[PDB]
A and B are shown apart, each in its own frame.
Chain A
């Protein structure tokens, strides 16, 4: 109720406390949102993929192919956040495995 809602605001306020961020950001409040769902309890890798593509395929005003012959179109909105090292060769053969869930 109200006693638990005021505690969630403090979690988002203290989330950007170590990152040296002044104003709060929407990407920091959703971090504690997942802990509230799993509070009463390689599968974690498959969770951050479904929750990411759902927020992208809901803003295109048009629709092209990007079905079977254009499997590399779904890699554009995800390579922007990639800025490490091993997420280019090792994770290259992993993209074709997650997309197989819709094919079957």
Chain B
């Protein structure tokens, strides 16, 4: 699986990489 089976970290940093770039684009500003 993912939690109890294999792929404990291979399928874990996928969401961490996507959540890291979203916190850096918060200053995108709508009117820009």
Contact = CB atoms under 8 A, between A and B. Distances in A.
Contacts of B1: 72, 75
Interface SS of chain B: helix, strand, loop or mixed?
Answer: loop
Interface residues of B, number: 11
Interface of B: 1-5, 7, 11, 14-15, 18-19
A75 B7 CA distance: 12
B14 A79 contact: no
A83 B2 contact: no
The main secondary structure of chain A at its interface with chain B is loop
A88 B4 contact: no
Contacts of B15: 85, 88
A79 B18 contact: no
